[PDB]
């Protein structure tokens, strides 16, 4: 988690149960342990005036 | 309490599957191979330090 | 986050989905980049599970 | 407003509907010209969802 | 007045019905000659809705 | 007097009954020789309507 | 005496059943040698009756 | 133990399950290696029962 008190980037928060002043600071969770995968495909021009998928 | 956390690393022999790999032989005949590896953590301190964090 | 069912479909056929959990009509959809959004089924689709399985998408039931 | 189901069928065949929100029995149709109306299904039609998908019509479920 | 289902389907294939208001188990039907009657599905038949849609017969649901 | 569902099927396969009064699961059947009885459907059978329609057997529903 | 579904279908395909007393999910099965047992339908099956009538076994229902 | 529905189907397709007790949505899977776990059916899958019977998998219903 990234916790910000009135948008000042308070600190970094480890997993588990935690406490924060309600209506004062906000926490944004982000997936760090998980591994993310992306697929990129295209018809692309080569050196010898050739196109390949 | 509330300040110290712990990471778990299993010492068992761990298997890993590689599927539908494509390999070209000496005579340029491409053929599909699927194999498997089995690895064990020889030293846990080195495994944690060298690898990114402590993730498998 | 609420996302409609159609774009969830052409995301499934364009294999950006990794895990889908179906408790009831709703589906908890996780993308390949670990972004999750809920979807609602408009009406029961017999081809839905078949399409999900053929695209090698992880499917999770619920108690 | 209210619109006959066959009217909705021929309407979606000619590709001038944009958004179709399904709430169980009822359908809230959005036209391409920002016209909104209501349609009802006679009986469970498996071909309906397929037909709406193949013509690139947005479909939105409800809780 | 109640009209038999076999006679109903044959009359639909005869292209003599104009409107059919379907109430779940019930159907309220208007002939082309402004004759009103009422019929019943014996058991769920999607081919019914297929036949009415292909015959350009008006189909009406209600809340 | 109750008649087996299977026996009903090879009997109607022989073109020997005229009317089928369908009341949910149970069916009131009259043969060509004015013999009346009742038959019960074990489970939902989609081919029942197709077979009954193909062989010119009249069907009537109930309120 | 309870017998599983798969072996019951094996017996049906191997023709050692005479009549089937279907009561909801339960099926009271009598072999051709007058052996009585009970089987259960786990999930709705769309083809069991097709094979049952193909093998010409007397299927009955229960009120 | 809980094992996902898609994983269970991959397992049965690879000849790894022996008997499956189906209790509504819940399924109690026993693998050929005497390992037992539990899975849940996400939505109504007609192909499930055919896949189970085809791969010579014992299927058992429950009251």
From TrEMBL, chain A:
Role this protein plays: HflC and HflK could encode or regulate a protease.
Subunit structure, as described in the record: HflC and HflK may interact to form a multimeric complex.
Name recorded for this polypeptide: Protein HflK
Species of provenance: Escherichia coli
Compartments (UniProt record): Membrane
Family, as annotated: Belongs to the band 7/mec-2 family. HflK subfamily.
Coiled coil start-end: none
UniProtKB/TrEMBL annotation, chains C, D, E, F, G, H:
Subcellular location: Cell membrane; Membrane
Leader sequence residues: none
Function: Acts as a processive, ATP-dependent zinc metallopeptidase for both cytoplasmic and membrane proteins. Plays a role in the quality control of integral membrane proteins.
Subunit structure of this chain's protein: Homohexamer.
Similarity annotation: In the C-terminal section; belongs to the peptidase M41 family. In the central section; belongs to the AAA ATPase family.
Protein name, per record: ATP-dependent zinc metalloprotease FtsH
Portion of the full sequence shown: 33 to 95 of 647
């Amino acid at each position: 988690g990234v916790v910000t008190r009135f948008g000042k980037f308070s600190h970094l928060v480890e997993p588990g149960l935690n406490w924060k002043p309600t209506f004062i600071d906000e926490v944004k969770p982000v997936n760090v342990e998980a591994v993310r995968e992306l697929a990129a495909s295209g018809v692309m021009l080569t050196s010898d005036e050739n196109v390949v998928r | 309490p509330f300040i110290e956390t712990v990471k778990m690393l299993d010492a068992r022999i761990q298997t890993m599957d590689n599927q539908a790999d494509r390999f070209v032989t000496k005579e340029k005949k491409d053929l599909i191979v699927d194999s498997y590896i089995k690895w064990r953590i020889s030293d846990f301190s080195r495994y944690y330090l060298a690898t990114g964090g402590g993730d498998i | 986050r609420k996302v409609d069912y159609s774009t969830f479909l052409q995301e499934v056929n364009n294999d950006q989905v990794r895990e889908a959990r179906i408790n009831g009509r709703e589906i908890n959809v996780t993308k390949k980049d670990s972004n999750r959004y809920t979807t609602y089924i408009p009406v029961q689709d017999p081809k839905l599970l078949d399409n999900l399985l053929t695209k090698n998408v992880k499917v999770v039931g619920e108690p």
